Amino acid sequence: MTFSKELREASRPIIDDIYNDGFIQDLLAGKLSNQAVRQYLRADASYLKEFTNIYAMLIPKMSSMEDVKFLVEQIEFMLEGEVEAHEVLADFINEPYEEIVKEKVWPPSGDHYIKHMYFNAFARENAAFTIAAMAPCPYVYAVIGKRAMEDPKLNKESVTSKWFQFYSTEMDELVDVFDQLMDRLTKHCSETEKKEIKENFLQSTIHERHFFNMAYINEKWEYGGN
Amino acid sequence: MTFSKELREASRPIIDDIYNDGFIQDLLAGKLSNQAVRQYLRADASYLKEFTNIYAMLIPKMSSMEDVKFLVEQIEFMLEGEVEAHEVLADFINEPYEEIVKEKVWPPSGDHYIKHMYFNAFARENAAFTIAAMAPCPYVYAVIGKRAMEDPKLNKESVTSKWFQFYSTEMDELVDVFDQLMDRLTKHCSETEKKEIKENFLQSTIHERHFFNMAYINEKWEYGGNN
Amino acid sequence: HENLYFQGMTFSKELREASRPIIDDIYNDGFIQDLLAGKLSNQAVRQYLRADASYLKEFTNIYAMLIPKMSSMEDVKFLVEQIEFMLEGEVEAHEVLADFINEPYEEIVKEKVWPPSGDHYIKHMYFNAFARENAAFTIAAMAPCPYVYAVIGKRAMEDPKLNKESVTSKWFQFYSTEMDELVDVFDQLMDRLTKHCSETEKKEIKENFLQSTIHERHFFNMAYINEKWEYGGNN
Amino acid sequence: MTFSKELREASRPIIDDIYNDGFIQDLLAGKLSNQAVRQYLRADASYLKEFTNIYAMLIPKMSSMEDVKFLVEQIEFMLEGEVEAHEVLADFINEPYEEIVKEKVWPPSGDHYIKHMYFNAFARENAAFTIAAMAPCPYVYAVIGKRAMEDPKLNKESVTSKWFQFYSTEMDELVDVFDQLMDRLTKHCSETEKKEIKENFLQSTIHERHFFNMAYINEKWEYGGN
Structure with missing residues (x-):
């Protein structure tokens, strides 16, 4: 199998754990708490802001023109906002998205x-x-x-x-582009590099699990100790 | 006087030197050589495309989402924008603009x-x-x-x-957009920072002087020797 | 005056004080308590040494990255000295733990690991x-x-x-x-370098310190419980 | 021919230009002006901290301990060593080296x-x-x-x-150390990468030409009229 397929397949058991965790289970059932939704929407916004800076930082790494336009198109899509899924969650808890995201949440x-x-x-x-x-x-x-x-x-x-x-x-569409880029950009990589890149993908799948759960449990930095 | 206006005012004596240099003087007269025009257009097209990276690099430094939109707009212009002034110089030398800029020039x-x-x-x-x-x-x-x-x-x-x-x-309009961007970004800078920022501005005004003159004198990295 | 001190404390002192409740938690956690008693498991020692060797390698790189940020040549010399010291090899503390488990240090730490x-x-x-x-x-x-x-x-x-x-x-x-010496130098640098920082900058610098104190707690506990990346199913 | 030897051979015509320029020719004759000597020594002393930064920045990029030790030893030499050639130029113009370098110069x-x-x-x-x-x-x-x-x-x-x-x-000895480092670090580089690395070397050889000449002509950023 190809590199991106290997990464995707290796990540699936972690995704099964995400699906079976409380956040996604309660959301599946239409019973996720108002607090979990609010903390997710507030955090998600902070993460997404950085996902956009990250795209910008990739522009100088690209040698191909098509790849640069892809990155710029992504930044523009992220700057338009108003993702239908956020509006769905906002409606679900009877708070406008504008009012919910006034309180920033990097747990x-x-x-x-x-x-x-x-x-x-x-x-x-x-x-x-x-x-x-x-x-x-x-x-x-x-x-x-x-x-x-x-x-x-x-x-x-x-x-x-x-x-x-x-x-x-x-x-x-975005999953297909990322797979094509990982497959293409890793053609001349060493086995040690490919291992590190694979690990990055698996770790980020774990980070996704932790991100939903962070909202679910209201994870905070506990600076006062115990 | 605002910081951005102080910078622009300080740059004026350098702009006077640029105006009186051979590139602008010969261009005023419609007497600039075809070679100078061609090399200038090649360098301009080569660097305009490269500036894409500089704007991209500033996106994470902006706290304002309107400043990010400004930067993304400029990237789009670097990638697919047209400048009517290019067509003017292409017409002056009787060559198509897109043919002229096929060869990249990095002096x-x-x-x-x-x-x-x-x-x-x-x-x-x-x-x-x-x-x-x-x-x-x-x-x-x-x-x-x-x-x-x-x-x-x-x-x-x-x-x-x-x-x-x-x-x-x-x-x-772009001069004004840059003025407002500099004034807001420097609102809380120290005097040492302001001096360095001013120096960057004056240096880049001199770089613009050299951008015209490098086309004018066909400046090259002289790797092969004998001066 | 009001710029230099907050509630009678320099900036470094404020940070140190704010971190103390977390340090008390670290001291009373299993890793330090078992180590105090000479009862820390051989496994925990090995896990600590492997991760700590990886951490110290990166700590050295961080010192190198600070050099261009320093305006004072004396500060650059301090950083270069710290790097030189790191490169001489094995912190004596690591040799003590290797001796505690009756194993040569070079056989314990063989590969990079960032749990x-x-x-x-x-x-x-x-x-x-x-x-x-x-x-x-x-x-x-x-x-x-x-x-x-x-x-x-x-x-x-x-x-x-x-x-x-x-x-x-x-x-x-x-x-x-x-x-x-290093605590003293870092405190002096934090006090000097924050003199003209905004309240927003100071808040973020303070949070960096408290986060890292929490990271220290988690680092010891990581070794204690054999925390590792779990890339498989049913976790 | 090794990669590093290729770079050095390619640089020779530039070095011939440097040798025939005013700075080296006047120095050869024992008549380089006092002002040129001072400006040269001041520039050399002024960039020492910047060169130190460059070596420090390379430390995290090295996979080999011995390469890290080399970079650290270079920094140490620059910070604590003395270059006898500086004392020779100071003696030539009858001015103490420490006095000459009190003023910084950044042309x-x-x-x-x-x-x-x-x-x-x-x-x-x-x-x-x-x-x-x-x-x-x-x-x-x-x-x-x-x-x-x-x-x-x-x-x-x-x-x-x-x-x-x-x-x-x-x-x-330093020339040899740099040769071996460039040969090792470029062993798996693409032809595009090697061309860029070679260009960096040739450009820096020209920068050395201009480092001597900027002292020779007292080059300045002229921010005013003419």
């Missing part, structure tokens, strides 16, 4: 994930290292959305069902 | 200029250091364009008069 | 080294290393629970004095 | 040179790109020194003959 797991993406963006000249760190985001969401649409436990009577419907189709 | 003076921008983008946290290295260009060209329109040496029978006409009006 | 907690700590130090111009941001991210170790070492030397019959007592003894 | 040609080194240190993960930007210096001085010792135009009665004598042998 510890977010800080780790974001600093993982930045480490690669600063330290590695080959964009594959950073792409591998960001790619689990759309892949995880796609797998979850598609699975939910065929899960007999999907609560179709809740507006939360539209969150899964959104991710079941809207990530595929 | 020693251009290397210095782009590495000045990169140093600031890499090394300095405050985007002002890099914005000050990029901002002189539109002001240099605006000053030249406006001055040329009232100059007795302007050859109005040559299509080159349209190059000056273009620059006399089409840079003013 | 989850170490990975976070290292990437936090690097973020600051790459992203922040003022060296204070990076110094704040690294300073809990010598500070935590100094506080623990000094506390242990006075603690009646210290097992003085075990060679592990020498680990605490080493840290009770060998970090003092 | 336009020096700004170009240092920004070329920094560009590479920041942008290129492989240290070879920056090493190639640094390595010409000792080779330029070695070639000049050895040529001077066989040149009948050398003023052997002037203390300046000792400057050429110093450089005729004191750079050779």
Whole structure:
């Protein structure tokens, strides 16, 4: 199998754990707490802001013109905002998205994930290292959305069902581009480099698990100790 | 006087030197050599595309989402934008613009200029250091364009008069956008920081002087020796 | 005046004080408590040494990245001296733990490893080294290393629970004095470099220090419980 | 022919231009002006901290301990060592070295040179790109020194003959160290990468030409009229 397929396949057991965790389970059932939704939406916004800086930092690493335009198109898509899935969650908890995201939320797991993406963006000249760190985001969401649409436990009577419907189709184009880039950018990489890039992808899949759960448990930096 | 206006005012004596140099003087008269025009257009196209990276590098330094939109707009222009002034010079030498710019040209003076921008983008946290290295260009060209329109040496029978006409009006908004960006970014800078930022601006005005003159003298890295 | 001190404290003192409750938690956690007693498992020792060797390698790189941020040539000389010292090889504290488990140090530590907690700590130090111009941001991210170790070492030397019959007592003894110069230098640098920082910058520098103190707690606990990246299913 | 030897051979025509320029020719004759000597020594002293930064920036890029030790030893030498050739020039103009270097000098040609080194240190993960930007210096001085010792135009009665004598042998070990480092670090580089690394070396050889000439002509950033 190809490099990106190997990464995707290696990540699937972690995605199964995400799907079976409390955040996604409660969201599937249309019973996720207001607090978990709020903390997720607030954090998600902080993470997404950095995912955009990361795209910008990849521009100088690209030699191909098509790859640069892809990155710029992504930044523009991220700057437009108004993602239908966020509106679904905002509606679900009866708070406008504008009012919810006025309170910023890098809890510890977010800080780790974001600093993982930045480490690669600063330290590695080959964009594959950073792409591998960001790619689990759309892949995880796609797998979850598609699975939910065929899960007999999907609560179709809740507006939360539209969150899964959104991710079941809207990530595929981006997943395909990231796979093509990882496959192409790693052709001349050594086995030690490919191992590190693979690890970046698996770690980011774990970071995704921790990101949903961070919202679920209201994870905070506990500076007062015990 | 605001910081951005202080910088622009300080750059004026250098802009006067640029105006009186052979590139602009010969262009005013519609007498600039085809070689000088061709090399200038090649270098301009080569660096415009490279500036994409500098703008991209400043996106993470901006706290304002409107400043990020500005940077993304400039990237789009570097990638797929057209400048009517290019067509004017292409017509002047009777060659298609897209044929002229097939050959990339990276002279020693251009290397210095782009590495000045990169140093600031890499090394300095405050985007002002890099914005000050990029901002002189539109002001240099605006000053030249406006001055040329009232100059007795302007050859109005040559299509080159349209190059000056273009620059006399089409840079003013960008000069203002850069002024507001510099004033806001430097609101809380120290005097030492301001001095360094001002120096970046004056140096880049000199880099613009050399950008014209490197085309004028066909400046090359002399790797092969015998001077 | 009001710029230099907050509630009667310099900036470095404020940070140190804010971190102390976390250090108390570290001292009373299983890793340090077992080590105090000379009862820390051989497995925990090996896990600690492997991760710590990887951490110290990166700590050295962080010092190198601070050099261009320093305006003073005396500060550059201090950093170069620290790097030179790091390159001489094996911290004596590591040899003490190897002796405690009756194994040669070179057979214990063979490969690079950044377990989850170490990975976070290292990437936090690097973020600051790459992203922040003022060296204070990076110094704040690294300073809990010598500070935590100094506080623990000094506390242990006075603690009646210290097992003085075990060679592990020498680990605490080493840290009770060998970090003092570095703690002093880092405190001086933090105080000097933050003189003209905004309240927002100071808050972020302070959070870097407290985060790194939490990272120190997690680093010891990572070794204690054999924390590792779990890439398989059913976790 | 090794990669590093290819670079050095390619640089020779530039070094021939340097040797025939005013700075070296006047120095050969024992008549280089006091002002040129001071400006040269001041520039050399002024960039020492910047060169130190460049070496420090390469430490994290090295996989080998022995390469890290080399970089640290270079920094140590620069910070704590003394270059006898500086004392020879100070003696030549009858001014103490410590007095000459009280004033800093950062000319336009020096700004170009240092920004070329920094560009590479920041942008290129492989240290070879920056090493190639640094390595010409000792080779330029070695070639000049050895040529001077066989040149009948050398003023052997002037203390300046000792400057050429110093450089005729004191750079050779560093030239060799840089050779071996470039050969090792570029062993798996693409032809595109090698072309860029070679260009960095040739550009730095020209920067060394301008480092001497900027002292010779008292080059300045002229921010005012004319």
